[PDB]
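Hi R.,

As promised on Friday, here is the backbone we talked about, encoded as structure tokens. Could you run it through your design pipeline when you get a chance and send me back a sequence?
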């Protein structure tokens, strides 16, 4: 799916952002940005509309919904694929998420082969 899809990692973690940076590179990707919270993503995504956005779920302060749900509030591009990253997974949470653009949800930590398993499972609907 393109060897340079744009990704946005807003994980406040002070080390996880580094792991994914490489991991993605292993999948053939050289174009990622970074933030520290939703207010940051909203101000940093006005850049050019990333094709992919990775965000934790509650590490910065509130949650990522408002950060994502807002993206959907737009239109013509509410399909922005998002692979939110979280520990474990409660259906109640993965639901309100997909109901928006959180369409992608990968637990963590994942192995480049594991992430590759989820990503490929999503692009099957995007058909690139």
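Update: got your reply. Pasting your designed sequence below so it's all in one thread:
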């Amino acid at each position: 799916a393109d060897k340079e899809l744009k990704f946005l990692v807003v994980d406040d973690f002070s080390t996880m952002r580094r792991i994914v940076r490489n991991l993605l590179k292993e999948l053939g990707f050289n174009n990622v940005e970074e933030a520290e919270d939703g207010v940051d993503a909203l101000n940093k995504l006005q850049a050019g509309g990333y094709g992919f956005v990775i965000s934790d779920w509650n590490m910065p302060n509130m949650d990522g919904l408002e950060l994502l749900k807002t993206i959907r509030a737009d239109g013509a591009m509410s399909a922005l694929p998002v692979l939110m990253v979280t520990a474990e997974a409660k259906k109640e949470n993965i639901i309100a998420a997909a109901q928006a653009g959180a369409s992608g949800y990968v637990v963590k930590p994942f192995t480049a082969a594991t992430l590759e398993e989820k990503l490929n499972k999503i692009f099957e609907k995007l058909g690139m």
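One thing I noticed while checking it: The chain has one domain: 1-128.

Thanks again,
M.
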